[model samples]
Target chain A: MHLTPEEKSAVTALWGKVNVDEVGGEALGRLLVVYPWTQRFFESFGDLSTPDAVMGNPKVKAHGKKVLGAFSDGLAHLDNLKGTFATLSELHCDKLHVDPENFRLLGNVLVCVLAHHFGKEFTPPVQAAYQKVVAGVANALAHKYH
Target chain B: VLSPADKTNVKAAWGKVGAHAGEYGAEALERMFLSFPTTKTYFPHFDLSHGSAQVKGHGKKVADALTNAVAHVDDMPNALSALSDLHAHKLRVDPVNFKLLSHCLLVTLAAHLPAEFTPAVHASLDKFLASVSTVLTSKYR
Candidate 1:
């Protein structure tokens, strides 16, 4: 699913307004609350008893920024989506052993958070474009799983 | 070797820069490119010159990575090993470029966090930057 120049610009412009660290932290926090099993990948937060406790951890906040920063980097090179996704896939699949299902979960939560943040700016077309982008990333990361 | 207090101070100071990451990160990358033009050869696709969206976005990534790295100083090897592999093997980036960029990043941090950028902070960060470069260059040797 290719995004038109206008659609790409619309999303990029919107991203420029948000603080990635804060947004990423909040989104990941929400994800953990809704899907507690995803916490298994985060060894650093193993000692935390609650999702709220995990959210408050500085390590979590930093990891969230790293996660979302990858999305930001991928968006910057949308034209090179294959290479972007390939590298990410190798990292998750080979190095990290992240569950493929978790990528879907992460994409869903990320979209929900982004939609809430963007409000009126997340129009039908924009939402559609973002869905494709998220799916592309999830699918790429799922390659090794299959 | 950062003391316990130095680690806290470094993280606190970087938090301020991370708050305005896009702006300061861009300036840091711009300074690196200006100070060492040859580094641009590594990024044939990127516009290393000032005021380009490519440069600005890449700058933010660099700063964000450093911010995250600083936050996880205790796990420096694990935190930065992947990046090291990517830069050293896949990208084949010269180790010297990391040193140049670190120097530029220090200038950028000093400029942005003038009040908090004390002598102790500078010394700790300087050591931290060296560690980062060392880790990134580890795959080369």
Candidate 2:
């Protein structure tokens, strides 16, 4: 929970290199393949029974960018995280009845995607920092669920 | 994830639990929901009444999935990858709830099959459930 200055630097420095659309798309695709039940939420996309089908889904790609964009804002506005995700929290828990746990899931998947992109540079220090970011964002978005 | 002897004990105990898995599985789910109300959030659409058919059906599926896991305890990640993903991402189930369900399942086993759930079998079964819980709760490593 406590992010040292160095840990914060580790995250922000790496955040610079990320390609939001590509990484988010990959993470979402992989998330759906690994966590198949999530497909229930994306039924409109159609035909995600296989890896290729999921990866190639139009909405998955489109929604991934939007999803990852929210994550990026969490990092940029770490101090105002709850405020940042307030609408998303209401949309999921209050309006949509979507399980708020999905927020944590997507956040976790994004971290994995980042690790893949950064490879050797995504050291333990960076991971710890990134985890805080994800956890904080997830908690904020999951606020309404409580 | 198991010692050689532990695996053997687990297999033997699971054999007794297998054929009648649905019967025991239904009871276990009921115990979980009743004992930990928070877990009910994971099954919002389910009929959460004590003896709901949907719960029974889901319990059977869980038992079947556990049986499948028993066959590949040595390679659980690959065996339960899709399930792991669903738990980690879509369902976003809290990791602690897995322990709650595990505890309920163990209790159900003891109540119904006291003789078969021997001390050694209990230990082995706990190990197997804990390992499987870890697999399900993590984002596939």
Candidate 3:
């Protein structure tokens, strides 16, 4: 589905926020821990061993762990939880290889993950922000992709 | 000499750079301009005042992917496979442009990174970049 203007602006604004010194931190780490789980979930399209099979595939598992670790470490280093999450969302877009629009899909995936992990910590505004930002980033990515 | 450990070290080095993606925006754009003068040619189709911001945003996306790739060097096949697919189906950026952009990345890295720069790191990183570029470009043909 296409993203609305509010969604796009939220994504762009979050992107801008991540780069700011005060924006990114521990919450980013939270997102990192959750990100691969999201990636793994997406890869579970068919019968693939366990959920970790994607990471279990000796070829790429280490890389997955390392990226997840770095993101986690980065999150720990940040203080402003809001900015950290924003940065994490923005960083997903930076990969040259991913479908840009997937960033929003990433948001959707994240929303589910957060609900699973954070429970009460996952506030309504936070979820909405995630949705809007993901939509925005995803739209931007889609435009770039096509 | 490059050993597997050396390779890991190099990949980690690149991962750090990727981690610092936000900080590299201006530098990425400057390098993009220097490496692919034609990138600006595409700019006219979009807003100019927002050019820096746009490039910065784009750079972050690429950096995110690159960061993940380096951080997960051992799991490269799947990552590369995914990348190859995106390059072919999504980005649609020319392989030549990929090569050109990579060259710019190297030039930028060389210019920016002085103490860490060395023949070995330079050679290894360049080789890695070329291999990926080939994978991407090959997807087109």
Candidate 2 Cα RMSD (Å): 6.4
Report lDDT per candidate. Answer: 0.71, 0.82, 0.50
Per-candidate chain B TM: 0.91, 0.94, 0.76
**Quality of model 1 by C-alpha lDDT:** 0.71
Which of the numbered candidates is closest to the native, going by highest DockQ? 2
Model 3 iRMS: 11.9
> In terms of lDDT, which candidate is strongest?
2
What's the candidate order when arranged by decreasing DockQ? Answer: 2, 3, 1
- For all predicted structures, in order, the TM-scores are 0.48, 0.61, 0.43
User: DockQ of all candidates, in order?
Assistant: 0.01, 0.13, 0.02
Clashes of 3: 18
Those runs of model 1 whose alpha carbons end farther than 4 Å from true positions after fitting are A144-146, B1-141
Tell me the RMSD of model 1 versus the true structure.
20.5
For model 1, residues B71-141, the per-residue Cα lDDT tens digits are 78888778988888887789888777876677556656655565665434655676688887887788875
Query: Which 10-residue window of candidate 2 chain A scores lowest in summed lDDT?
Result: A93-102
Rank candidates by lDDT, best first. Answer: 2, 1, 3
RMSD of 3: 19.0
Q: What DockQ class does candidate 2 belong to?
A: incorrect
Q: Report the backbone clash tally of model 2.
A: 3
Reference contacts reproduced by model 1: 0.00
Better of 1 and 3 by TM-score: 1
